[PDB]
Design a protein around this ligand. Sequence first.
Ligand SMILES: *[C@@H]1O[C@H](CO)[C@@H](O[C@@H]2O[C@H](CO)[C@@H](O[C@@H]3O[C@H](CO[C@H]4O[C@H](CO[C@H]5O[C@H](CO)[C@@H](O)[C@H](O)[C@@H]5O)[C@@H](O)[C@H](O[C@H]5O[C@H](CO)[C@@H](O)[C@H](O)[C@@H]5O)[C@@H]4O)[C@@H](O)[C@H](O[C@H]4O[C@H](CO)[C@@H](O)[C@H](O)[C@@H]4O)[C@@H]3O)[C@H](O)[C@H]2NC(C)=O)[C@H](O)[C@H]1NC(C)=O
Ligand SMILES: *[C@@H]1O[C@H](CO)[C@@H](O[C@@H]2O[C@H](CO)[C@@H](O[C@@H]3O[C@H](CO)[C@@H](O)[C@H](O)[C@@H]3O)[C@H](O)[C@H]2NC(C)=O)[C@H](O)[C@H]1NC(C)=O
Ligand SMILES: *[C@@H]1O[C@H](CO)[C@@H](O[C@@H]2O[C@H](CO)[C@@H](O)[C@H](O)[C@H]2NC(C)=O)[C@H](O)[C@H]1NC(C)=O
Ligand SMILES: *[C@@H]1O[C@H](CO)[C@@H](O)[C@H](O)[C@H]1NC(C)=O
Ligand SMILES: [Cu+2]
Ligand SMILES: [Cu+2]
Ligand SMILES: [Cu+2]
Length: 499
Amino acid sequence: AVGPVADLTITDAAVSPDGFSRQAVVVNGVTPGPLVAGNIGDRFQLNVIDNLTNHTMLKSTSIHWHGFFQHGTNWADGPAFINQCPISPGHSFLYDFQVPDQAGTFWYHSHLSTQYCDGLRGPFVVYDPNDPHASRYDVDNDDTVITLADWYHTAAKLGPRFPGGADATLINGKGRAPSDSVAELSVIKVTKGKRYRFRLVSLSCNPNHTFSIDGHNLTIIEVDSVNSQPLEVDSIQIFAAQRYSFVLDANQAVDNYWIRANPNFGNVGFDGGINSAILRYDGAPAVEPTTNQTTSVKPLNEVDLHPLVSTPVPGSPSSGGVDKAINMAFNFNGSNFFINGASFVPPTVPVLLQILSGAQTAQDLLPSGSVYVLPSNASIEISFPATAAAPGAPHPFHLHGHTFAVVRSAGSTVYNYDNPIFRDVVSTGTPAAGDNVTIRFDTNNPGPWFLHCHIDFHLEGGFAVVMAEDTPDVKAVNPVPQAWSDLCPTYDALDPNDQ
Ligand SMILES: *[C@@H]1O[C@H](CO)[C@@H](O[C@@H]2O[C@H](CO)[C@@H](O[C@@H]3O[C@H](CO[C@H]4O[C@H](CO[C@H]5O[C@H](CO)[C@@H](O)[C@H](O)[C@@H]5O)[C@@H](O)[C@H](O[C@H]5O[C@H](CO)[C@@H](O)[C@H](O)[C@@H]5O)[C@@H]4O)[C@@H](O)[C@H](O[C@H]4O[C@H](CO)[C@@H](O)[C@H](O)[C@@H]4O)[C@@H]3O)[C@H](O)[C@H]2NC(C)=O)[C@H](O)[C@H]1NC(C)=O
Ligand SMILES: *[C@@H]1O[C@H](CO)[C@@H](O[C@@H]2O[C@H](CO)[C@@H](O[C@@H]3O[C@H](CO)[C@@H](O)[C@H](O)[C@@H]3O)[C@H](O)[C@H]2NC(C)=O)[C@H](O)[C@H]1NC(C)=O
Ligand SMILES: *[C@@H]1O[C@H](CO)[C@@H](O[C@@H]2O[C@H](CO)[C@@H](O)[C@H](O)[C@H]2NC(C)=O)[C@H](O)[C@H]1NC(C)=O
Ligand SMILES: *[C@@H]1O[C@H](CO)[C@@H](O)[C@H](O)[C@H]1NC(C)=O
Ligand SMILES: [Cu+2]
Ligand SMILES: [Cu+2]
Ligand SMILES: [Cu+2]
């Protein structure tokens, strides 16, 4: 792991995670990027060095630290043209923030256009020396992070606008495509008799994955950085950008067991060892598993997840029993997505910079129709009714700057105002099911926060809005460093081909 104080150098480089060589955006020479780690309470000073030279994958960059509240450091949140102008090539930019009140599994990724699909993404763990789940496991380290990524042979700006699946699912940076049946698989080592806290992070740009491990059950103890009660499952459907910690007890026979991550579309299944990695017990031969997948009899259901500690749902136990309720009506016209009639187009002046320059109302803030001003210290309910008008479901939505209660989950008609899980990325389900996924949060974090589909190609097509929270306190609460103030003039000074 690198961090909490570290350089992250961004370059273009040839990679071959599935035996197919292609130029990609890499972090400290690798994609997925290295694990960044620290402890609860730490100040992170992540110096992002932009040494990119390839305009097609973008020479500029901006990095989001996914899941962190960024209270008082909204300028460091990442979304290009919401919280900063991008970092320019040949420049560095210091993200400097604290994590006083969170611990769990996170990740970092480019939040500029579709650049994270081209490889700028990696895991991020904040450890708790007093973790309430510590007694459930023996090992929790760099080697118990499991990343899932969709991998494309054609670059994000060069392929279809909305790809119909990846060429390969990568598990810990490796996996197979049909073009190379013998590409090196990832191996995750376990010692028989030891218990492992596996931190499963979806770095996916698009597909979700149904994760399971042959012959082993899993005990979920964390959901998007929120400690949960232990939930035993035998498979996990994980959506783009979500995280789970699960405990695996390595108490089976010394052997090789298939790790499976089946995408919802693309090359589905396991022919030739695609969508697979290897769980290898110390002492097992260095060969492929020959284990068989068994039917999931205890799949994860989100409604079965509950916080480990008592966590009150904002507002009052009835539909709309909050200070402010907002419904998000989805539309799509073939190239662009819309929320409540507006397709998001990034403004010239980042939303935070607009607020710093005086714009405090929806009327003054750009882009018009995409910014929702929220009152301070208020309960907010947002519903995302699934509709056929918005193809590419299930759409996992992410709210920046907050965790939220999932009062109603996908595939459920129940509203849980008592003990629902809190998380930061939620599937908005499908119209076939009549889904109306509904979340609640409190506004105790002044700043503009992006709320968007985390299928990166959909974000790109405008599937996003901004929650402009407590605009009158934003400037005072979020003092910006000189380096941040320098970003926009430097970016705006660039030749378009240097962007
Ligand atoms: C900036 O970034 C962008 C986006 O990433 C990047 O864009 C690439 O742009 C190029 C040119 O337009 C695109 O090129 C196409 O690339 C196709 C895929 O090539 C791969 O496969 C090649 C063939 O593979 C086989 O053979 C080898 C050995 O013989 C074997 O190992 C394999 O198993 C397999 O059997 C392979 O040669 C190639 O490897 C080269 O390129 C990579 C990438 O850098 C490099 O790492 C290697 O060192 C090596 O140089 C690669 O693995 C290719 O099929 C295609 O060629 C056909 O189409 C053209 C159409 O014009 C025909 O005219 C031509 O005759 C071929 O039939 C073409 O070359 C590429 O797809 C884009 N990349 C992506 C990811 O979208 C820019 O290049 C970047 N800028 C800079 C300066 O790097
Ligand atoms: C993972 O969790 C699953 C679900 O809880 C466990 O499955 C249960 O496993 C036992 C086998 O150990 C099954 O019961 C046995 O069935 C056989 C054959 O029918 C019978 O001969 C035995 O007397 C015994 O009753 C049980 O049916 C099964 N439950 C299911 C599938 O719903 C599984 O064992 C757990 N795996 C591990 C590695 O702990
Ligand atoms: C999804 O849930 C939302 C929030 O409850 C529903 O929106 C409300 O609908 C009623 C009509 O029954 C209106 O009076 C309210 O103003 C709506 N709330 C808003 C706009 O915040 C919505 O209809 C549900 N959608 C589906 C498809 O069930
Ligand atoms: C969809 O709407 C966008 C934004 O309003 C517009 O630019 C585009 O031409 C439309 N696309 C199609 C395929 O009709
Ligand atoms: Cu994210
Ligand atoms: Cu989407
Ligand atoms: Cu985001």
